[PDB]
């Protein structure tokens, strides 16, 4: 059902970019133009694609446009999987980033609420106090020493450690890592920290910070003291120091109305809105 939903959008996406993409005549901007982007990528071997949103706004009469734009974080691996099968059809180790651009309506920092979680949004502000460039794992090779330790695995999502099930061989749940610091696939990311525009703030209060993470292609493209436009996906980061705010803040005491008898591993959770972006254009 839901896998039929996401797979249905997946085949509609493969069907989308396989077909025509240029409506213009001989005076162009000729056909196709996506296959020129794949093959032009094949000659230089740089492993990204820049696709527009307006062309996808043309075709489906807005039906698929209202299907990626809301639950975007749900639809990474289906999209990236279908694009990988298009590549194995038309091309001969691959890490693909699908960075949209040219969105209709730009919001500020004040229009951020929490009903807009998951979606895409165009944020414009001012870069101040950038940081440096450091790696990140996201490709584990971690299993127990008794005996097999060759399992490629999870921690694409931030946990980090460790692998849980199908262990080890043979040391079962929850025997896990030692990890491996030589068998992985890394990439690099920095964390710039945007500050709100000077010609926008409601008279009268003070400017307001926000954090933002850049992975992959858009490293180093930011500039200290310049305006930017970003890309929307807007994740949630676990936070600590908001205790005694006052609450009432929830907690996660696990259930025991199952297991029959013959400890208190309860937790806290408090979350602050960060932002995650992949395309940086420096118009301003």
């Amino acid at each position: 059902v839901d896998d039929v939903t996401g797979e249905k959008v997946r085949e509609a996406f493969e069907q989308f970019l396989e077909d025509f993409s240029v409506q213009s005549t001989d005076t162009g901007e000729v056909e196709k133009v996506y296959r020129a982007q794949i093959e032009f990528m094949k000659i230089y071997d740089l492993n990204t694609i820049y696709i527009d949103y307006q062309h996808l706004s043309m075709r489906e009469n807005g039906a698929l446009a209202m299907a990626i734009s809301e639950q975007y974080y749900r639809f990474l691996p289906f999209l990236q999987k279908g694009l990988r099968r298009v590549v194995r059809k038309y091309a001969p180790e691959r890490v693909f980033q699908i960075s949209f651009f040219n969105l209709p309506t730009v919001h500020r920092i004040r229009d951020i609420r929490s009903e807009k979680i998951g979606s895409l949004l165009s944020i414009s502000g001012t870069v101040t106090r950038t940081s440096e460039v450091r790696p990140e794992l996201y490709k584990a090779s971690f299993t127990c020493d008794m005996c097999r330790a060759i399992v490629d695995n999870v921690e694409q999502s931030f946990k980090y450690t460790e692998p849980t099930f199908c262990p080890n061989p043979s040391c079962e749940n929850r025997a896990f890592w030692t990890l491996n610091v030589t068998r992985s696939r890394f990439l690099d990311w920095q964390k710039v920290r945007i500050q709100e525009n000077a010609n926008e703030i409601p008279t009268g209060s003070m400017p307001r910070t926000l954090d933002v993470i850049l992975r992959g292609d858009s490293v180093e493209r930011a500039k200290p003291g310049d305006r930017c436009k970003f890309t929307g996906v807007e994740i949630v980061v676990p936070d600590v120091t908001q205790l005694g705010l006052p609450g009432v803040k929830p907690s996660s005491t696990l259930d025991t109305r199952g297991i029959s008898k013959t400890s208190l591993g309860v937790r806290d959770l408090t979350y602050k809105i960060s932002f995650l972006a992949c395309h940086v254009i420096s118009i301003g």
Binding site: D2, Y73, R74, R110, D111, I112, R113, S114, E115, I117, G118, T126, T128, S157, T164, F165, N173, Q195, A198, E200, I201, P202, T203, G204, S205, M206, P207, R208, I235, V236, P238, V240, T241, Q242, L243, G244, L245, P246, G247, V248, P250, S251, S252, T253, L254, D255, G258, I259, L269, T270, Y271, K272, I273
Partner: protein, 646 residues
């Protein structure tokens, strides 16, 4: 009979009796008000809720007092907020259903019946302030006053959870309703065994909006010897971004009390609880003081239309608008309005008149690029003491919507902006707004303008000229505007002004900075005898018969016509100062330049004359200026000029 365990309420009598309230209401609040439109309210306001699509009906409390019966439901409401508010929600929804069965084809009946309707009460008493409150009275409704310092960012709240596994994979979910979230250990796929790992994906679940606003109040009838105080309150979903930094707000809400952890490490919940407020309804506008502008508001006019909210602007009714167009036809409005400002102080009608013209300040013209011309005018007034300088400043401090009152030798260069500090409750570095950013749009006041430093008074060279402030230190490097209308005063060396001495000499200022101020008064005393009889007759007129009667003869004084007169004169007028007066205006300016060979005259006099002139044209409802009335706009400087001869 049924009852609830904590209370004495019953669902039947509250429901049917409140239904019996919403069908009959015929101005019994006026029967208490003594009578000095016969159709009831909530059919009309329920239709205004109906066609416009807005939610959020709101009612008073005195209306629940005046009707008999349901004198009982008021005392049920003031004690037990949550349950009674839930009951009134349910019967409002069934009253909408009981309306829609009159015409049967109305608004696609399912969803508009499905949409949540809610109640916001206010005006529920004000007996004793925040200090007196015993811990007997934990959960009630409370009214407060006072301003607002800062505003925390947005923090979410879980309303729905979301779970998966790695086997193989099924995706059940769970709600909150009480304090905690339980999670299952097993299973899905197979359900039963194996007891697989149960993960939580925290990018898929629902959320809410929770904003914390810190407040400081002014609880009149003080418990002597009380000092000021600070409360922290915790607004919710719809009312997020309904409070800036600086407004004067009257709040309702429920007093609460929840313990806090110790050192974020153990479960030792410390005793000696912490208290806060849990707001329900925000009351920004008011009927006694002034009303906010519109050229400032336009960002939150551009917002707040997608989501239905509170009014932020005083609602101009229709009947008294005819009285506005009637009083505008009076000839003597130019001395009537200036006479009716401060009815307890009696001289200086040029000064009262200039203080009236500070409330009508200029025309806000914005260019394509650059420009940004405000309507700021700026007034000094000095002279001998014992001249009631302070009464004027307290009265203007009451009338102004966003006024901030500093003083001399209680200032610093830090003391007007960027109080970057350490907030205690969250233990981070939070930046505060100083004394001019709170003054943003409105009237500031400064006493003893002589006794500043050099560092202070070097702030005002930016605010008076550029109409900016440029903070540049370690927190934030970003300019931020503070439009404001500065009013000040100073006391000379004398203290009596003596003749045959230069006017610039007798007040210790550099005369370029004295030359930068628009309108400079010099109020001195007369040794003659004829006025003082009327003076003492005014004072003993005030002291007598222990009742406020002060001026009723032979004068008509509007009480609160003038505030809506000023606000209506502040939105719907754009005066333009076209061709026919430039001959007289440039002619008088070159005539002013003639004196040369004490004070001088620069281009600030010319900028002064156009902005003061069109400010006079803003009065009396004229979209253009005339060649006539520019003469007395010169004479407001010429009265001081006749006061410069001695």
């Amino acid at each position: 009979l049924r009852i609830i365990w904590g209370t004495n309420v019953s669902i039947q009598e509250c429901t049917t009796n409140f239904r019996n309230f919403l069908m009959s209401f015929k101005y019994k609040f006026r029967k208490i008000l003594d009578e000095r439109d016969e159709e009831l309210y909530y059919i009309k306001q329920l239709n205004e809720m109906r066609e416009l699509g807005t939610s959020n009906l709101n009612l008073d409390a005195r209306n629940l007092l005046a009707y008999k019966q349901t004198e009982d439901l008021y005392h049920q409401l003031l004690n037990y907020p949550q349950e009674v508010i839930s009951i009134m929600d349910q019967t409002i929804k069934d009253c909408m259903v009981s309306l829609i069965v009159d015409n049967n084809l109305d608004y696609d009946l399912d969803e508009i019946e499905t949409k949540f309707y809610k109640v916001r009460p206010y005006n529920v008493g004000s007996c004793k302030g925040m200090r007196e409150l015993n811990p007997n009275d934990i959960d009630k409704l409370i009214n407060l006053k006072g301003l607002v310092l800062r505003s925390t960012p947005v923090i979410p709240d879980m309303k729905v959870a979301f779970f998966k596994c790695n086997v193989c994979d099924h995706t059940m979910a769970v709600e909150i309703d009480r304090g905690v979230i339980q999670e299952p250990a097993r299973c899905e796929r197979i359900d039963c065994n194996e007891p697989n790992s149960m993960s939580l994906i925290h990018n898929r679940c629902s959320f809410a909006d929770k904003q914390v606003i810190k407040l400081q109040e002014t609880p009149d009838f003080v418990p002597d010897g009380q000092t000021p105080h600070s409360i922290s309150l915790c607004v919710y979903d719809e009312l997020v971004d309904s409070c800036r930094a600086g407004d004067r707000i009257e709040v309702t809400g429920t007093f609460r009390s929840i313990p806090i952890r110790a050192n974020s490490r153990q479960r030792v919940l410390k005793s000696l609880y912490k208290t806060y407020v849990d707001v329900v309804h925000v009351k920004v506008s008011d009927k006694r003081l002034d009303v906010d502008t519109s050229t400032i508001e336009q960002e939150l006019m551009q917002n707040k239309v997608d989501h239905n909210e509170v009014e932020e602007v005083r609602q101009i009714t229709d009947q008294d608008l005819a009285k506005i167009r009637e009083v505008a036809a009076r000839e003597d409005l130019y001395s009537l309005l200036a006479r009716s400002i401060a009815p307890s102080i009696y001289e200086l009608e040029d000064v009262k008149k200039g203080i009236l013209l500070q409330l009508f300040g200029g025309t806000n013209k914005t260019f394509t690029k650059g420009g940004r011309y405000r309507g700021d005018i700026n007034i000094l007034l000095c002279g001998d003491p014992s001249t009631s300088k302070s009464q004027i400043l307290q009265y203007v401090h009451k009338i102004t919507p966003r006024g901030v009152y500093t003083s001399g030798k209680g200032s610093s260069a830090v003391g007007l902006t960027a109080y970057i500090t350490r907030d205690v409750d969250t233990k981070q570095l939070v930046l505060e707004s100083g004394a001019l950013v709170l003054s943003d749009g409105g009237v500031c006041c400064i006493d003893e303008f002589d006794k500043m430093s050099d560092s202070t008074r070097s702030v005002l060279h930016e605010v008076m000229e550029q109409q900016t402030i440029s903070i540049a230190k370690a927190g934030i490097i970003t300019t931020l505007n503070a439009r404001s209308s500065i009013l000040a005063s100073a006391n000379p060396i004398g203290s009596r002004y003596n003749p045959n001495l230069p006017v610039t000499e007798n007040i210790d200022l550099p005369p370029p900075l004295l030359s930068r101020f628009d309108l400079v008064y010099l109020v001195l005393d007369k040794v003659d005898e004829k006025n003082d009889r009327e003076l003492a007759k005014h004072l003993t007129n005030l002291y007598l018969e222990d009742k406020p009667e002060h001026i009723s003869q032979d004068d008509v004084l509007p009480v609160e016509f003038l505030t809506m007169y000023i606000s209506y004169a502040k939105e719907h007028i754009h005066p333009i100062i076209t061709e026919a007066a430039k001959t007289e205006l440039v002619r008088a300016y070159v005539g002013m330049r003639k004196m040369g060979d004490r004070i001088t005259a620069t281009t600030r006099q010319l900028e002064s004359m156009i902005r003061l002139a069109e400010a006079h044209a803003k009065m009396k409802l004229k979209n253009v200026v005339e060649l006539e009335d520019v003469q007395e706009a010169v004479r407001l400087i010429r009265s001081a000029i006749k006061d410069y001869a001695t």
